[PDB]
Design brief:
This is part of a larger assembly, with four copies of chain A. By secondary structure, chain A is α+β, with helices and mostly antiparallel strands. Chain A has a single domain, classed as Ribulose bisphosphate carboxylase, small subunit (Ribulose 1,5 Bisphosphate Carboxylase/Oxygenase). The first copy, chain A, is 19% helix and 19% strand. Chain A has a four-stranded antiparallel beta sheet with strand order 2-1-3-4. The longest helix of chain A is centred in the middle third of the chain and has 14 residues. The first copy, chain A, is globular and about 40 Å long. The interface between C and D is medium-sized, with 12 and 16 residues. The PDB classes it as oxidoreductase. Keywords: CO2/O2 specificity, carbon dioxide fixation, metal-binding, methylation, chloroplast, calvin cycle, lyase. The entry is titled "Crystal structure of Rubisco from Chlamydomonas reinhardtii with a large-subunit V331A mutation".
């Protein structure tokens, strides 16, 4: 029996339970976005603004249900409408991470027919981050 | 007249007002669990999650009565159902404290007829803890 | 025109706007307690528990009116019932401040006919305190 | 496409999106106050009291609408009623910033006919402030 650690074991939604995505694996996800005609977009956040929190609820009556702070991140430029080139997306990942080397960065994609985000995964975390585990240290 | 110190004098429920339990005294408590046919279990928590707090109440209407965060700790493996061997319990204490040397660890036991925890006491605190006093410094 | 500074200028209720009390001035206040047959008592608090605050109100409905945390401090021993000796009070000030050299300490007195505290002033603040001004620096 | 940075990019209301005001530009704003017969005044705040916050709302029922802490700053002396001399205002700026070199300081002016503040801009921030960007680093 192995024990799932509660300490410094924060996750990041889709694909965070898999081994970290290689460049080849990221390119494959980008190909999938393009193949489906979805709209790629990059979003970023400083460390303090990365995980869901409750601070604004101090201002509320009994209306906190499904309200959380830090769901919104900051948009990198604009969604890439009309993008049919995976290399353009990869170049924007490089540009965003270069401009904000200490930020969390996630790649998302939108479907304008359902009008909903249809994919999303983390592509950068700050080097100072100490609040997560390697796959093989997730259980002790 | 001696004065009970209010400063860095945090307690830990059952047996925290006695001298710290020796290995022999811990073994005697484990024998008592086994003699009564209760279910031993270990639970642990990082320092920040060890004592009762109020943070989630920011999300509440007027319903905080008997709500506290940090009552639940994290289960080490599973409760030791069918355990009739005190040495097995003592070995799990060693294993748990080895895997989490910086955590608070408590031994508990369950009665499945009353369906309630029937015993409980601290077996480890982190070495960095400075929020408690030795027996002879609890009063000044 | 001089300007009353808002920065690090915390006060401590009765007598805090006067020059700090000398040992002779403290002795005179003790004489007043004894002369009136009031009950002297010492109370103390660590720095974080010294000034009025709001933290418990996170648990409340709309009932915070005239509720503040940190109004209660910790009693040194017991109120000195029957005390007819000013020197006994001065000795307890020495004893309390010796036991808690980093605490805020205040001398209070009770009237049991009105059943209310009838005097009170600070007799010690921690040496590390940086949130108050000497008299000649309260205006700039 | 340049990206407006969300990190350490705090603003300070009127004129904060322009290049920092030169001494000549400040003098011109003061001339404008005097020309219109408005009442000049200086206000200041320590760093922790400079930006709007919500802390007091812990005490509230459902009445936080348009309540914020830190809207009030501290008045330097009194508003300069009857002041028709721009050099007097500039000397008070010097005097205030000298007395409080580590404070935020803003120049304001009042109209007593409308009874409202009619102009306002920051004239000093503490040298330790690291939550703002120079004009050429606001976008990346």
């Amino acid at each position: 029996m192995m024990v799932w650690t509660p300490v410094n074991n924060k996750m990041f939604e889709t694909f965070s339970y898999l081994p970290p995505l290689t460049d080849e694996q990221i390119a494959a996800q980008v190909d999938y976005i393009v193949a489906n005609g979805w709209i790629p977009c990059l979003e970023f956040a400083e460390a303090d603004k990365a995980y869901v929190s409750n601070e604004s609820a101090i201002r509320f009556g009994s209306v906190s249900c499904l309200y959380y702070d830090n769901r919104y991140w900051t948009m990198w430029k604009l969604p890439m409408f009309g993008c049919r080139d995976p290399m353009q997306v990869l170049r924007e990942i490089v540009a965003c991470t270069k401009a904000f080397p200490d930020a969390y960065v996630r790649l998302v994609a939108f479907d304008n027919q359902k009008q909903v985000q249809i994919m999303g995964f983390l592509v950068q975390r700050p080097k100072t981050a100490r609040d997560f585990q390697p796959a093989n240290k997730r259980s002790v």
